[PDB]
Structure 1
């Protein structure tokens, strides 16, 4: 099981999940500029969409899209409780949150990382994004995690998306519930070890 990643990218989410499940895996750094693996192979041949994360299964199959990857992983180790059982109501609310984070938050960052974005539009984009974290902050005021009382794959995803905030000058320091939650998630051995292995920390 190999994970194609780029340090500090959205591939940190499946990286955290891989450690939290205790599965046997290997990672391979991808260079998003040249689209080449650290071993010199063409990454477009692996994933035509040219992005990370990408999970290579032991049988050879390739899986793209982070939300699909973390569900496949968590489903392999039911006993970890990183996702609810299939067909359970709690599972659909998790899927619901994974989609909210992928389309509203994750994709909300995109224009802030693009060079072709009008400097006059940046303020507008940043505000749309903060309104998203404000919603998340309100939710974290009556519960310990985004989907409930325990740590799930959606939490791994949110910690990852929160990390970028400083790099694009998005202020989230007024969101104390979110700030306390981030601090907690960061002291988890499996999360901390993921950051170390990637060169952050």
Structure 2
């Protein structure tokens, strides 16, 4: 397999974590895409991924798989024992719900805040910025942090009693928030402790 990404990107992390977690990290050669130089927004790369984002997976036959969820879906099913994605119908439903919610209410808003209300990748890559929109998404990420705090009050993992794709997404969201210095509120003690523990999980530890 080939992956196109940037090694310290919060979204690329989700896949890198999943790969370690499946013991498949060895299977992959990574190719660098420089986002600061806008390489992802160039015709060559849009040919690989219309959305212009990283990571992207390229199979041995040349099939391209973009989107973290989709790539994780693929690599988790590859070995016949879904570990991150759900075994039963209900596990599949709950993990996908909390994964999507993790994107919606935490990770995406942090990323939109970064690109629109901060300089982001810089005045040369960010052609249109909507400051007020990026701020609305910051506010949404803050509420999202509170939300995951109440979830992780009740449970050790976001989607039940096992580590899943959904935990990987929350981790990446807090990786991104740390990068742009959007502080997890003090009152979210469960989220903060859980995060510091997650940073020591072998799959996450190796990454950082």
| TM-score of Structure 1 vs Structure 2, range by shorter chain | 0.7 to 0.9
CA offsets, 1:55-91, max 9 Å, x none? 1112210011111111111122343622212x61111
**Following TM superposition, by how much is the alpha carbon of 1:181 offset from its aligned partner in structure 2, in angstroms?**
1.0
Counterpart-to-counterpart distance in 1, 2:149 and 2:29: 34
Number of aligned residue pairs: give it.
Answer: 189
> Please, what TM-score do these two structures have when normalized by structure 1?
0.84
> Of 7, 26, 29, which aligns to 1:26?
29
Distance 1:151 1:159 in 2: 11
Aligned counterpart for 1:166 among listed residues 178, 188, 192: 178
Q: How does 1:185-196 map to 2 (within 5 A)?
A: 185-195=198-208
Q: Deviations over 1:96-134 (max 9, x none)?
A: 11211223322212033224233x665543222111110
Runs of 4+ in 1 over 6 A off after TM superposition: none
Question: What RMSD in Å do the two structures reach over aligned CA positions?
Answer: 2.1
Q: Which residue in the other structure is 1:148 paired with?
A: 160
Aligned pairs for 1:24-103 (under 5 A) are 24-32=27-35, 33-35=37-39, 42-79=44-81, 81-85=83-87, 88-103=89-104
Residues of 2 paired with 1:7 and 1:150: CA distance?
26
Other-structure match for 1:7: 7
Gaps of 5+ in 1: 196-201
Q: Give the match's secondary structure for 1:164.
A: helix
Q: Which of 134, 145, 149 lines up with 2:146 in the alignment?
A: 134
Q: Contact between 2:105 and 2:140, CA under 8 Å: does it hold in 1?
A: no
Structure 2 unpaired stretches of 5+? 120-128
> Which structure carries more helix by proportion?
2
Q: Is the 8 A contact 2:107 2:141 kept in 1?
A: no
Secondary structure of 2:8's match?
coil
Q: Calculate the TM-score normalised by the size of structure 2.
A: 0.81
**Counterpart Cα distance in 1 of 2:165 and 2:93:** 13
